[PDB]
Amino acid sequence: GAMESHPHIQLLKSNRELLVTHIRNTQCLVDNLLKNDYFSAEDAEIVCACPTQPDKVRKILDLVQSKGEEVSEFFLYLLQQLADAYVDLRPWLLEIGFS
C-alpha cells in the first residue's frame, strides 16, 4: 500500500531525458552495481536493448527500492550539482509522482 517504496525511482525514470543529459548519469548504475553486485553494465546492457540505458537504470533502482535509488541519485548528482539537483529534486519527485 501507498506505493510501498516507489518515490525517487519513479521520478528518475520519468524525467530520464532531463537527468541523463545533465552530465554523466552513468554514475547511477555503478553505485547500484556496487550495492546490488550484479546490476552492472552487463545487466544494464542486456535489458537496455529495449528501454535503452536510461530506463534500464530505473530497473536497477526499481528492484533495490532503497539503496540503488538513494545512492544513484546521490552519486550522479555528485558529478552534476548536489546543490542544484539534489535540493531541487524534492519538488521534482512530488510533481512527477502524479498521484
**3 state SS for 15-32:** CHHHHHHHCCCCHHHHHH
Number of domains in the chain: 1
Report the distance separating Cα 12 and Cα 31, nearest Å. 15
Report the distance separating Cα 84 and Cα 47, nearest Å. 30
The coordinates were experimentally obtained by NMR
Contact indicator for 35, 67 with CB cutoff of 8 Å = yes
User: Which structural domain range is residue 88 located in?
Assistant: 1-99
CATH, residue 68:
1.10.533.10
Angle at 99 between CA 20 and CA 96, to 5 degrees: 20
Q: What is the dihedral of CA 17, 70, 38, 18, to 10 degrees?
A: 0
Report the distance separating Cα 33 and Cα 44, nearest Å. 10
Report the distance separating Cα 19 and Cα 33, nearest Å. 19
